[PDB]
Amino acid sequence: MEMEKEFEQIDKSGSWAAIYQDIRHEASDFPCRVAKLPKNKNRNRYRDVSPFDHSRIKLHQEDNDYINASLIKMEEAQRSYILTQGPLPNTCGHFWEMVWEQKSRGVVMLNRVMEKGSLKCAQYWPQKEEKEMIFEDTNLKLTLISEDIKSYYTVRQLELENLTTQETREILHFHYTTWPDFGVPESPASFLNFLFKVRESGSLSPEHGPVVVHCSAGIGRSGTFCLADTCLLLMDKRKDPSSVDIKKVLLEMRKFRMGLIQTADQLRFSYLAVIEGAKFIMG
Ligand SMILES: [Mg+2]
């Protein structure tokens, strides 16, 4: 396996930080002027994590179409993702409006609501069946239908209703709950297992809108999830699987949202996930 050889030699030479810095230098720099308008200050969780203008998701209701969310469209892989930040107390109705308008089937959440003793994300979905949430600014109702708590992740089914038109949709919420507070997982096994659960639900499939993926900033763990999914897709699709270059796929994704993969350890982990996922698939 070629990718496993490049991996092993980056490891023996301790080059991970230097490989990662070169990705940071080659990565696209596009304007984010809507993100930086003063009227959108409180729609952004981080001042240094903004969606590019050319790939930003626009809310359809008029007034302010801004949400911190980017469409990553992977042409050759035939896969699209919306990467977004963890919703803010003020942007939960926007978040669910985007899910509605983009005809998304799945939401992939890679963080806990509280990590390292701080709030990383608003509690933007209901925790009890009998206590639904209404988002008055975007006129949406959200109801917990069921949830399935496993050791490494939780799957929720939710009903999203457009109160304007009374249409209802089922949204699946895939919540990875065991990503360590510091660093990355020891073994890619549970992350891959989680990714395949998302795949098996249909949420990544072209009959639906793009999956919505977020962590706290929507670039670090979120980048890892999309990078691994797209790389494994490409390895299944291509005549030559060993022709799949993680670094070139990452740089392609970074044309659509800045900062994807935030650390050299997250880069190493992405390589790891793709390599081990290749065995379990293409073995
Ligand atoms: Mg109960």
- Of the residues 32, 215, 226, 231, only one is catalytic, namely 215
Count of structural domains, the chain: 1
Helices 264-280 and 16-26, packing angle to 10 deg: 100
Q: Compute the residue count for the chain.
A: 283
Annotated binding-site ranges for substrate: 181, 215-221, 262
User: How is residue 1 written in tokens?
Assistant: 């396996």
Q: What are the φ/ψ torsions at residue 145 (nearest 5 degrees)?
A: -95, -40
Contact 5/280 with Cβ under 8 angstroms?
no
User: How is residue 275 written in tokens?
Assistant: 């390599």
DSSP state of 42: G
For residue 199, report the distance from its CA to the centre of ligand 1, in Å. 28
- How many Cβ atoms are within 10 Å of 179's Cβ, its own excluded? 21
Cited resolution, angstroms: 1.9
Distances (CA, A) of 18 to 6, 25, 244: 14, 11, 21
Q: Alpha helices of the chain — where are they, by DSSP H?
A: 2-12, 16-26, 33-36, 92-101, 189-200, 221-237, 246-253, 264-280
User: How is residue 2 written in tokens?
Assistant: 């070629």
d(CA 160, CA 31) in angstroms, rounded, equals: 33
Boundaries of domain holding 153? 1-283
Does 215 qualify as catalytic in the annotation?
Answer: yes
User: How is residue 35 written in tokens?
Assistant: 């993100």
d(CA 72, CA 82) in angstroms, rounded, equals: 6
Distance from chain centroid for Cα 232: 16
Q: How was this structure determined?
A: X-ray
